[PDB]
Amino acid sequence: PTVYALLRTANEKHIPAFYLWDEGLMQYGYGKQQVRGIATTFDVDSHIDSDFTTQKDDCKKFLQELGFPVPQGDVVFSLAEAKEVAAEIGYPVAVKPVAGLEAAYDRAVAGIPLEEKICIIVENSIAGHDYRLLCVNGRFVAATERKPAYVVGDGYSTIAELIEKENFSPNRSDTPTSPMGKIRTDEAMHLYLEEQGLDLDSVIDRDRTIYLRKVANLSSGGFSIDATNRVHPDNIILAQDIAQHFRLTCLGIDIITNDIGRSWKETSFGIIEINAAPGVYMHLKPAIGEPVDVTARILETFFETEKNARIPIITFNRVSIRQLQKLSDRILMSHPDWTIGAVCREGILINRSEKILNRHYNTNVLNLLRNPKLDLLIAEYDEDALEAEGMFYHGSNLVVLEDPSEIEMILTRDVFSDSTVIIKQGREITIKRKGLLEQYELEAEELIEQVYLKEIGTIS
Amino acid sequence: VRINARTTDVFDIFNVKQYVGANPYLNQAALVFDFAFTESYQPLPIENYLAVVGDRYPRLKEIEYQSYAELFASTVAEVNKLEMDLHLKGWNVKPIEEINRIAIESLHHRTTKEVVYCVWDWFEFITQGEEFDLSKQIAILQQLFRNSVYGGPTVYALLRTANEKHIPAFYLWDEGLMQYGYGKQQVRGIATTFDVDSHIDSDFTTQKDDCKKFLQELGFPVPQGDVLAEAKEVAAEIYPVEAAYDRAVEKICIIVENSIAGHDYRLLCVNGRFVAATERKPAYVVGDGYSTIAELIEKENFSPNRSDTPTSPMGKIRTDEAMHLYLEEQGLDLDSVIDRDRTIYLRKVANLSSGGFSIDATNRVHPDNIILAQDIAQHFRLTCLGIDIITNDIGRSWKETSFGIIEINAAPGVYMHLKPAIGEPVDVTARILETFFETEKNARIPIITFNRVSIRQLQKLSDRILMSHPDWTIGAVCREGILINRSEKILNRHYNTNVLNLLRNPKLDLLIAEYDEDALEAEGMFYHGSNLVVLEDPSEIEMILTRDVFSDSTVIIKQGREITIKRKGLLEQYELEAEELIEQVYLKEIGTIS
Amino acid sequence: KNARIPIITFNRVSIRQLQKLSDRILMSHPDWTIGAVCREGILINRSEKILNRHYNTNVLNLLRNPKLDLLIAEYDEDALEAEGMFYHGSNLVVLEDPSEIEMILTRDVFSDSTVIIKQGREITIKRKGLLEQYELEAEELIEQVYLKEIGTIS
């Protein structure tokens, strides 16, 4: 769901993109403008910070030192009492637990301690809602409120029958197009239905509404609503301050508060956790509200225009290694600090050196477009290569043809408005440059090298 | 208490305090105490003390000591190095009233406290009793230091290099990292990992087989195996090298069709360049006395296998013989004897822990292998890369010799290249630090220090500065507020943590701070140096702020109506024309544009 | 970007402030020609011209000039309710105690423009997507805030 949105946005902006097997990554730029990543994690994201995000009870102290509103509780390995803290701190109004009065206190399943030792913290931030904030490149972008399911019916109906009737509603029908989904049940529903309702036997007296699960689950018939335009400036500044401290591209923040329209210094406010690789699908296709294009922001972080994602390319249809060495040496005289890559049917060279040629063609060109230091590509595509699989890149800045056949002429189809084309047939030379055409004849004992050695100056 | 202190002891020490950064007594962080006499008994003359303390270290007799306090301070300073040539050398004594206040430079405070206690106990035994065993305590102290946050070979090497290069560095708790800069020019990391290393490359480097496929598809020499039913050279048969195999039986890497060799080498790459290489050699045992058993080995254990000393060629030789089978393949009893027949090798896998050693091989590698390593390096966004190879001979090209690549590691230990058993040392931390910083100039930001100031003056000054550079970020802190540019933030109860929070900010361009007498006496400071100092009615203490300046600095002092300005050690003095504020003095002296 | 020039938008301003602003701009680009229009008069650089009865034709006359390099315009509530703006988008927006209607002046901006809003003693600034907010000193003027933001148009 998130990969395809990035692919569509890239296609709209004319940015290359291709998949790298044996690594499970996607690449966007060609030679040294490249960016590799998967979903919303990219290669510029740091290791230390991403690791530190997952360590709870240490982000809490870090956010508490520079004064930010966080709950007031502590870790527990006694799994016994230490109920002193429940009081050291105000009272256990509803002090909650989890890992990863003093009676239904941890008697509520005791959190079913699942592995060595961890539980409780305060719950003073028992203000009502759940909000998600997204930051890209340290700037506030989009916000969303999470809301769980509800039912509304009467005596004439039963919980299960009404749930089945609503599950057949056209808006909730299960398709990729529909935002919502099929309503499902689980142990949490039964756990929450002990207060006043009955398991599939209650009789709903009037319009009084039920919420079913407490914590919303977007897969199990929960939904979300857009809230981007109703956020106070103070909360925005707080989010920016939090997000400027990490070396990550996208950051997600979970907030619980009473009213999102008033300052955090006037109401009940609480920061729950921070996430490193957030899912951004809920912001693109909300249940009710307007969509926000976040993938455009993500891509504009790296590439301002299409020219910022390409390198110069030269393509032949028949060439030899000695000519390649001559051309590379001539180019290096004006740009001594570049890195040039050349490939043909006889060998592959990287700046006056010889490498090993792969058995399968069309893979050496892929290896040259993955090198993160390349500045210029020189490639050859004869008729057999074009009939086997086709070209690998798109467009070129210089095309040189020497006695082409019927198929090879297709190499002139994909060019820009500023490229140069050279064709030689017998003793006749045809040149197209900036939309202007020229034609003349060579003398005897002449070579085609002298024609393009002077034209090579334009790629600079 | 001193568990042993009892009955009598001439001397007494009390009131220990810890100072971070510059303090009234010493320039660096220090530990401070107060020394006195009990006066109940008369201590021995200095003649006896000296010679006894003048033995273990001849450097003590170099300088005169005068009173007892200087002798005690010098003794503590010399013992503090723990016989490891640490860069800690600093002490000071000041006589106040009848007492003497002594401060000594420290990096780990607990270690220095223990050193002081031990020296006091040694001193007190020079009369009553007359005996001591310092060697039993020094080992304990060394282990305690090595088990600390600051204790570590790579960590301390980086600390020493930073101190030599004059680069600030301090430890960040909560997170648990180390920082080497101020504001925008900063870098954080632990050991050899840094914050500019990619999250994807590190995870990829641990996949083993996928790295093998990736390296193979670029034309590199790697083993050709594939990763029981059939599956045992069904068609895995090339140069084959079943009951024995099954009883002998890492993740099913079946494998080694192509070649094999003996010698294992490790290459280290920093910032896509080649620096240093090392050969690993296992333990061997020989010499004429007959049944080596644990003998020629615990005689070998005699001249430098001084495992105990943390500075020694190599440790000791221990067994856990699991390679007994190995030797059993060669055929000998654990216990029988031989003479001058070969070398024998206790462990097949060279484990530098139990007896294996390291040999320098930097200046005898073929340039072709250097090119190959550099080409492999420049495909990941890491800063330090380690490559393991198996070669028949490292001195020739890899095309004409058997060669192989087995492992690539992202966080290599660089201790081997610093302290080789045989060969010359090679410095690797200097390259690491030169990767990020070039001089000491580009690791610091402009800092302004005040003596007493309020919020409104700070806002006026920050606005005045912003009129010149509109895009900067400016941080200001005082006794009742903290500001970024023009906005207000929350103030922490512990005063010194606010400066830390401001220095952790990755966008700061300029710092403005104020230190009064109470804060300066409680905890010294957090930063070192200044670019502009302003004093208004300074006290006796609140002038030590002039000791830490650079050659190009500006100092302004206002004493009564008199004003004094010092620029590059040029003094100009004036008197106030009338009742005027000091802000007019420095509002026109903003010359940090450079 | 080859078909546009920089534009600055106010909602209330006088001829005394326009001359100071243009004079400040001319110190770094001595050879430019700048045009400013408001309800009290119309200026080219430092000189005075004739003002038309129909307000929206002055902007057209300025945009037809074959030498202009920068435009400064004011659009209050009555002008917006009469016929609407004449150009599209702006690079810098200044608002001082705006109404309900005038807030729409912040709707059509680019991704690197600057917006300044003043309400009472409160100043709010948005710059390159980053927000900032603070308070004045009960004696300062708005001119001290935007005089240092003119570096972006350059």
- By the 10 Å C-beta count (0-12 exposed, 13-18 middle, 19+ buried), A279 is classed as middle
Bridge-based pairing of strands A139-147 and A223-226 is antiparallel
Contact B59, B78 (CB under 8 A): yes
DSSP secondary structure, A272-321, as one string: EEEESS---HHHHS-SBS----HHHHHHHHH-SSGGGG---EEEESS--H
B-contacting chains (≥3 CB pairs under 8 Å): A, C
Nearest to C132 among B467, B470, B487 (CB): B487
A227 Cβ neighbours under 8 A, 6+ residues apart: A131, A143, A144, A145, A260, A289
Residue B486: list chain C partners with CB under 8 A. Answer: 132, 134
Beta partners for residue B264, in sequence order = B390
Contact B343, B284 (CB under 8 A): yes
Taking each helix axis as running N to C, give the angle between helix B109-124 and helix B68-80, from 0 to 180 degrees, rounded to the nearest 10. Answer: 130
The residues of A whose Cβ lies within 8 A of any Cβ of C are 138-140, 233-234, 236-237, 240, 300
A430 Cβ neighbours under 8 A, 6+ residues apart: A422, A423, A424, A437, A438, A439
d(C-alpha B179, C-alpha B186), whole Å? 7
A137 Cβ neighbours under 8 A, 6+ residues apart: A249, A297, A301
DSSP secondary structure, B369-416, as one string: HHHHHHHHHTTSS-SEEEEEEEES-TTS-SSSS---EEEEESS---ST
Q: Which amino acid is at C107?
A: R
A171: DSSP letter:
G
d(C-alpha A293, C-alpha A285), whole Å? 10
Across the interface, whether the CB atoms of B199 and A47 are under 8 A apart is answered: yes
d(C-alpha A179, C-alpha A282), whole Å? 9
Query: Phi and psi for A121 in degrees, rounded to 5?
Result: -160, 180
d(C-alpha B118, C-alpha B120), whole Å? 5
A-contacting chains (≥3 CB pairs under 8 Å): B, C
Contact C73, C10 (CB under 8 A): yes
User: Which of B506, B514, B515, B433 shows the shortest CA–CA distance to B169?
Assistant: B433
Give the residue on C whose Cα is nearest the Cα of B456. C137
Å from A236 to nearest chain C CA?
8
Residue C111: list chain A partners with CB under 8 A. Answer: 300
d(C-alpha B510, C-alpha B473), whole Å? 7
- By the 10 Å C-beta count (0-12 exposed, 13-18 middle, 19+ buried), A8 is classed as exposed
Residue A296: list chain C partners with CB under 8 A. Answer: none
Is residue B34 helix, strand or coil?
strand
Binding residues of A for Mg(2+), as ranges, are 273
Q: Which two tokens stand for residue C118?
A: 């003043």
Is residue B276 helix, strand or coil?
strand
Across the interface, whether the CB atoms of C148 and B467 are under 8 A apart is answered: yes
| CA distances in angstroms from A447 to A342, A443, B370, listed in the order given | 21, 9, 40
User: Which of B26, B24, B170, B180 shows the shortest CA–CA distance to B106?
Assistant: B26
Q: Which two tokens stand for residue A187?
A: 């142990």
d(C-alpha B344, C-alpha B341), whole Å? 9
Contact A377, A368 (CB under 8 A): yes
CA angle C57, C61, C65 (to 5 degrees): 165
Contact A311, A32 (CB under 8 A): yes
Solved using: cryo-EM
User: Which of A396, A402, A405, A399 shows the shortest CA–CA distance to A429?
Assistant: A402
The four Cα atoms B285, B290, B292, B293 give a dihedral, to 10 degrees, of: 160
A26: DSSP letter:
E
d(C-alpha B132, C-alpha B315), whole Å? 28
Q: Which two tokens stand for residue B578?
A: 């009338």
Number of H helices, E strands in chain B: 16, 22
B31: DSSP letter:
E
| CA distances in angstroms from B220 to A223, B216, B405, C32, listed in the order given | 52, 5, 8, 62
Contact A210, A150 (CB under 8 A): yes
Taking each helix axis as running N to C, give the angle between helix A294-302 and helix A2-12, from 0 to 180 degrees, rounded to the nearest 10. Answer: 60
Bridge-based pairing of strands B193-194 and B188-190 is antiparallel
Query: Phi and psi for B526 in degrees, rounded to 5?
Result: -130, -25
Terminus-to-terminus CA distance in chain C, angstroms? 14
Contacts 24+ apart (CB under 8 A), B84-87: B84/B142, B84/B310, B84/B311, B87/B160, B87/B163
| CA distances in angstroms from B551 to B530, B567, B570, listed in the order given | 11, 9, 12
Contact B388, B260 (CB under 8 A): no
| CA distances in angstroms from A401 to A390, A420, A443, A452, C4, listed in the order given | 17, 11, 18, 11, 42
Is residue A372 helix, strand or coil?
coil
d(C-alpha A180, C-alpha A169), whole Å? 11
Contact A17, A29 (CB under 8 A): no
Contact A403, A423 (CB under 8 A): no
d(C-alpha B459, C-alpha B457), whole Å? 5
Across the interface, whether the CB atoms of A50 and B188 are under 8 A apart is answered: no
Q: Which two tokens stand for residue B122?
A: 């040694």
